[PDB]
A paper describes a structure:
Target deconvolution and cryo-EM studies reveal that compound 8 is a potent and selective inhibitor of the chymotrypsin-like activity of the parasite proteasome binding in a site sandwiched between the β4 and β5 subunits. Leishmania tarentolae (EC50 value of 40 nM) was comparable with that achieved against L. donovani promastigotes (EC50 value of 14 nM). These data suggest that inhibitor pharmacology against L. tarentolae is broadly similar to that seen for L. donovani, providing confidence in the use of this nonpathogenic surrogate for subsequent structural studies. Apo (3.3 Å) and 8-liganded (2.8 Å) L. tarentolae 20S proteasome structures were obtained using single-particle cryo-EM.
High-resolution cryo-EM structures of apo and 8-bound L. tarentolae 20S proteasome have revealed a previously undiscovered binding site for inhibitors of the chymotrypsin-like activity. The binding site and binding mode of 8 could be clearly determined by the excellent quality of the map. Unexpectedly, the inhibitor does not bind in the proposed binding site of GNF6702 (20). The ligand binds mainly within the β5 subunits proximal to the catalytic T100 residue. Hydrogen bonds to the side chain of Y212 (β5) and to the backbone amides of G228 (β5) and S229 (β5) within the β5 subdomain all anchor the molecule into a largely open site that shows great surface complementarity between the ligand and protein. These three amino acids are completely conserved among L. donovani, T. cruzi, and T. brucei but become M28 (β4), S23 (β4), and N24 (β4) within the human protein.
Numbering used by the authors:
A (entry chain X): 2 to 205
B (entry chain V), C (entry chain H): 55 to 283
D (entry chain M): 126 to 339
E (entry chain Y), F (entry chain K): 1 to 206
G (entry chain L): 100 to 301
H (entry chain N): 2 to 219
I (entry chain W): 30 to 248
Write the structure that this text describes.
Amino acid sequence: SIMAYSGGSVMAMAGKECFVIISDNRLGEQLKTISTEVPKLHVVNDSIVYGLTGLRTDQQTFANKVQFRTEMYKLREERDITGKAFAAMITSMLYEARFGPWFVEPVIGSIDKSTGEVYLCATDLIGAPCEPEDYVCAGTAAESLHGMCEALWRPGMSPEELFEIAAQAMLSACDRDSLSGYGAVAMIVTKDKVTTRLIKGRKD
Amino acid sequence: TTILAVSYNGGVVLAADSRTSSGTYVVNRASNKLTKLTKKIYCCRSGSAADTQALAERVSNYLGSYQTDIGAGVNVATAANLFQKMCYMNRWNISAGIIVAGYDPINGGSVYSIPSGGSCVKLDYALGGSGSIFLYSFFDANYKPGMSKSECVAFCQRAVAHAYSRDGSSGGLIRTITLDADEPEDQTIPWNRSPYCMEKDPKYVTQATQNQPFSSSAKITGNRMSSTG
Amino acid sequence: TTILAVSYNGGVVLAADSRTSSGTYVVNRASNKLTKLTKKIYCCRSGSAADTQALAERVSNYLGSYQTDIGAGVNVATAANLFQKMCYMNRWNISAGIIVAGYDPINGGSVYSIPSGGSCVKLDYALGGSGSIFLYSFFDANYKPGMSKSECVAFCQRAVAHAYSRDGSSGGLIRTITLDADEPEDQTIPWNRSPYCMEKDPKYVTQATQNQPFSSSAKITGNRMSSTG
Amino acid sequence: WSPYQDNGGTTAAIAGKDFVILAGDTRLNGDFCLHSRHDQSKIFQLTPYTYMASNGMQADRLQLQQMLKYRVKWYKYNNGGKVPSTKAIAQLMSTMLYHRRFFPYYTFNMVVGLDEEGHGVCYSYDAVGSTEPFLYGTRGSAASFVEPLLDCLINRQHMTSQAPPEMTKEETLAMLKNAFTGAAERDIYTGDSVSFFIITKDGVQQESFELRKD
Amino acid sequence: MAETAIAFRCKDYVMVAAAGLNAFYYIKITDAEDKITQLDTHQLVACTGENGPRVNFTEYIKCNLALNRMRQHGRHSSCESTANFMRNCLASAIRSREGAYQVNCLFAGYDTPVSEDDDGVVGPQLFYMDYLGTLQAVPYGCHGYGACFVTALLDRLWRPDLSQQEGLELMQKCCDEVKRRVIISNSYFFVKAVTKNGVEVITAVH
Amino acid sequence: MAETAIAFRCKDYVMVAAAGLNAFYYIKITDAEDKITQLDTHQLVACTGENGPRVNFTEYIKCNLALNRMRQHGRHSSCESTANFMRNCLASAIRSREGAYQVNCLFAGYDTPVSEDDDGVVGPQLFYMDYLGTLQAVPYGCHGYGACFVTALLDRLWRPDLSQQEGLELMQKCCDEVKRRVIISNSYFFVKAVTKNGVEVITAVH
Amino acid sequence: TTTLAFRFNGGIIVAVDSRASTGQYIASQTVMKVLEINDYLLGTLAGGAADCQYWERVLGMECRLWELRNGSRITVAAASKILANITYAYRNHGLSMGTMVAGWDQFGPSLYYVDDKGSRVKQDLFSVGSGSIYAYGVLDTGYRKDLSVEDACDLARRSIFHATYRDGASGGIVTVYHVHEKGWTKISRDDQTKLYHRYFPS
Amino acid sequence: ASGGSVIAIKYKGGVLMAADTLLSYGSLAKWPNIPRIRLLGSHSAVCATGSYADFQMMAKQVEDNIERQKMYHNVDELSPSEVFSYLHRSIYQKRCDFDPCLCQMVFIGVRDGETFLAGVDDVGTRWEDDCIATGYGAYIALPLLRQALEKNPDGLSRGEAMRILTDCLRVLFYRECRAINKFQVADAASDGVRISEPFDVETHWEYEGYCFEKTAII
Amino acid sequence: TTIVGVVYRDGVVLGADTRATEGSIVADKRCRKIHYMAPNIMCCGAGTSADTEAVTNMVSSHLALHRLETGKQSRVLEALTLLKRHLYRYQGHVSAALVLGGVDVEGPFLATIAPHGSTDRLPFVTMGSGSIAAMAQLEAAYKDNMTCEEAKELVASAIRKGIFNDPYSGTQVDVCVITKDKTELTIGYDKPNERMYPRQEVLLPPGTTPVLKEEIRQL
Ligand SMILES: O=C(Nc1ccc(F)c(-c2ccn3c(N4CCOCC4)cnc3n2)c1)N1CCCC1
């Protein structure tokens, strides 16, 4: 698979007036591990963080194309792009390539700075948005992450609680995936503050 | 799909079944394969519903523009020739068995088969679709040209019914339309009033003796229809 | 190939065209697809001539041995059941649409279609071969059971003729054979005396107006048949 | 025509110190439809102390089940009434699966039961009989969801907290009820009910439990 | 894959090795083709694939870097900059009619302060690049069949603080391990290093 | 093909070299596996393929030859005889369910007079054998990627009358030319020779 | 899988990882990849876990039957051959199994690699499995004949560790054995994440 | 030659099975007068979707096995369960020989009170349920039959079970291509299995939305 | 997916399940498959979610732009023709299967657009994986001139057939009632699959997961 080549999984999770987005750290070529210090998270602004899974080339190209679009937006619009608009922009960008797609699966966490209402959006490689109340994931450990997140996740979780279940999900799911792990960088976004945490996991 | 168009004196009868099938499931039970091009020129559409609908809409639009700009009626030959060009141009891309038929006051009733190659043949009658292959022998045997308008309609309905009774890919309603000097008469025969079906034909009431009770004799009696007997 | 067998009261009529074709060339113009198994049990052979001849000879030989050792006539059911076993055992190796039909004094006239799967269906009439597909609608419309021996032969010949008029893969002579309590009556209708052909049907005398002289009018007249006109 | 068909469903087992809870959902799905919500073919008693759970293709699970039932019956006769240990049945299952490795049973088996010392154990298998004794196991459509969750909640390897006491029969049952409820929600081929079997020294105590019917 | 390239980065140099082997099917055309192209005074790329793409890629980068200096009045671009220029060029190519450049690069460099005002990275830089356009900063990395042998050896023996001398010894163990273990005869390695002073060609190690 | 075997025959010895390389995909498992199996006191076979067939073939020949001596009261079979025995065994196999033995042999031997009455060939014998069962007497011959290199070099430098010493020099040139030119690392060659006196293992040449 | 053995003056070290991986999903992190054929013989399993487990168990049966029939322990040569004869018989039946037979017989320590294609190679050092390419880099650089048993286990354990760190298909518990004149002893069984924090303390 | 869909449902004191009386040969509707439901000994009936030839052979093999055992040894006739067990093992053996019985049987029976209903696939998948269907019956009819069992959880009366079968046959007629509007219903009750004389179902075709003017493309 | 439309006396009812799936896995339990096309036109989508989203958005936008040009409520035929022509152009590579319901001045208008750009204008339609199950309920229970309640209940019944009998369909019935005047989109009209077993809250207290580094940033 072209999507499983580089490895890496990403997951995002909605709490009360906060979200956690967490990527593993591995970069690979099939089974050979190139680096153990390649988190897949990108910070658009205070309120939006996204991960890209899939073919590392395209994670990097797509992430650049997005950085271009979000910075142009910031100059033209004279404001930070919102999670909804950012997600919509990213589906537009992925669907521009329907026939010859980007091998990326973006996971977007966002938070409205005023309302405190959390927006997650995973996307497939051709832009199909998936916008659930609870959690989204992508990458090589996605089958195993869905299981962990379904089990551990509750609705109205505080940031600290949410981080723990996201970390335990990402770590436990990555322990059953050859192509993801070497711990995780998680990022706990609130209205007030953005915590970033490197999480100790296996070396495997 | 079963489509046919026969000529009577004044004009033509187009007739179709009403079933589109994704192979072995009936997606639509009440399709209208008789597709208007002008007031008095219809086509019957067999093959890819997508392809024939697209062509019929393209050709209908060209004929409408043409009719406005010449400021006269369109000839059936014109409709057939446009349809042939499109069916030929795209013969590798589309699956489209078309029958253009209609009335113009110059040539009266005309029928053109435009089959899958993009040949255009002007005929007294045309058959088309999966179900066509059933009717060639039906027409050879029972079709007599120089029918009344009424007889052609009754015959076209009896034909379509004979085809859809055997073709699995054909079924449902029999739609006809008569195109002549008069206002077009569409009519829709529902399957429960079809002129023929095998289910009601007394020929096929007695069941094949396939089952047959365990007997002390090679004499075939009937099917075993009760465990007690 | 067109083969059929209908039942009348006393017995059965098998009928068949006479053409074996290597696709588009007629290898044999006068084949006999009505193949004796016993005195009064024939089969009609469709598909691989090699495969059906081989089966018909195998089954004929088993039936002859059987008839010798039971010291009585063979039932058509027996012939059908043997032919089914062989056509089923080898269903992947052979291409063989068979119709076993015959007379036995127990069950009178009997027809069995053994199509390509190795199904064995006991029927009032059976159709087989490339040409069968033309006849299903012909029978549905024109076949009436409880025919005379003479009417069945006339009908069976008219049928085979209607099939071989439209099927390229069928043609030539129409061979029939009546099997009943009386001595078997084979007869062979040559193509020049066939009860139907499209070439002689007045319906198809007037040619399609395909050619059409270069004119100053949209009025379709006829085909251009002279360079001077 | 494929000789193979995946009939979906998940099995899971968890061993404690005196017992195994063995669980398997009851939906038997065909091609794009579902055949039954009440298929009990997934779990099969070999001995009072030893059960086999079996996923993938039903028809092969049903053959394999009978093939083992008759090897186990022969063992009773040849070993003077003595029923084979869970360990013996686990090697037998490895051996029987491998003997078919040139037209393999499309069946992801577990053998689950008490060992020599009364302690529970689960042998999970691949297609061709590679196994190991473990204290839990999962096979089937939702195995990839349930196995990480069981790793997390039993082994706790990424937790600084002190390991909870032991996990009783009722806590272990509850953990599986939860794990299946999750799998049923997210796996489209797991659902309807879970049959739980609670193998103990005393005897097998079995209770059904409802999942999302969709 | 036939031609192994090795690089690692220490406090005050990046060391790059690359197998001389040029081959045609099973015939060694030469054991001494230099795969390490100097892009600027303080930048080079051990590029490994067939000669055709390897040259057409490295020359295109080298010429566009020189062009960018001509137009930027002799301003020497950073290593992050040319690494990203190189990956964008490789990545552009995988969605082009031409197809991918089938070349795997280790792009090594020493970033010096380019003025009084330069607040940027000082020191050695090393970037692993796949043919696809995967760019990753690494302390060491390898392409080729020998990659995994040397990558493991370097995990074991590489420290960030080795001398230029401990680096030669280490590079010789890496090269020797490719010779011992890969069936493709990588009998001669070109070894270069980038220091504050620039590219130097190491002849001791081969 | 990876593993090159070379042999040539002079007035009073056959010299056989075979590459030590055993490989798994691109990983040298060892550079020093002996491909040259002694079949009798004055007979040996540089056999080159994967280890599985090479051993199963050579051992089968060796055991049948030994069995044939046990039953023939210690009579040492001629080289033509074992060459033909071997080719019939290879040829039988290409029409078997098992498939061909994927092994290429150079079967070298010295025929000594086996009694007072022996009127047969005296002296060194060399037989090229394809995996298919092609047997051909040759003055010299080679299997492997290096075959055509060494075959040309021998066409140039081989005389029928070389000393044991001029043969060592020549076998070194042959081995060296494989190392120089084949991309597959054949870094160590086992060299054996058959003389009147028997098999001797040449250590000088490698 | 990563799995290495080597001969040295103290005898044979055998070291293995513990992970069974179907390329992507980790089936198990606790697979025993050293089969203890008899008291003086060790197999290693790589490739198809079933194929190796089955055929090493057969080998173990032939080795035990040998000991019953002949009243003496089988040689490593003969045990490696028995397995090479199986894998050669099944050479075009798509077995996947790279194996090492390591033992101490009458003729001292012997180590053989045995492939799925019937290869049977006798050398002083091997590594087998997806992570061999990694193990070999560490193993070849640190390998001498004159190693102490302590230092030979260290080398082995580090060599497996460095494969587990880099190979996706390799991981879990780094088990090390020592084959000596008195048989084999299981030296150590260490988790490869604990080994990371031992070998790289910072 | 192929059988279309079979549908079956348990009612209070028996099982109804229904099938079109049609064998198709591809698209072609070859024979509309085929008795597709077959009685197996005294208690059981069987009907198959798929190769009529494979059904004809299997049904023969089974029906012999039942009559032989009963007649040779003075034993009680095989139960529905046991006849079905034999049919299942037979079909699975054929898929293990790569000579499959390329049809999905539905199997009904009643010994005493004991009411048996089960399905078996080409590959030897088998399932008992309160309603079974094969072919397009599985995709079309099952949803409706299952809904009728969910609504009447105590159990259906013969009338309610017949009303729902008839409504499923109507839909199969509308939506299965290779169908005719001529059915037979096997009814396994205590006395044994009866097969109905063939019947048709009333069909609605005159919705105002099926008129020529609405359904027109142009 | 199972999406359903019926024409009733006063308008159209559309119906959809809610389960989105990545392969064999439910990505979103409560995703909305009934898309706004215009004030008087809705459009349920099956097939490739990306394509259904893109084609439905593209058209709704064109209809909106065209509504400013005409000053005239968008006709369901205009919507239908824009989807057909788009889908046809792409030869089914844009794999959007659609159920377009609306009520213009010509009256209730319900149609399918197949991915290849075929249309069937019918009084009851189904698309998606659970189309056949749903259609069985519709063929069994549809009559002409249903009340709004009869029609909503029938559509929910049809969707439920997909939910329970198709694996790709699930969760709840979203229903939409387009009448001449207004468009009422009821989300979870029917929720047959509530909660079996209340979620066992596994408690992981803060500091459970070991953390190497931590950067806090205040805003
Ligand atoms: O490695 C082998 N020999 C050898 C022989 C036969 C084999 F089957 C396999 C082999 C095969 C699949 N292996 C896996 N797979 C890969 C693919 O991803 C999933 C997990 C993991 N490990 C594996 N090792 C190894 N040797 C290296 C040099 C000496 C011999």
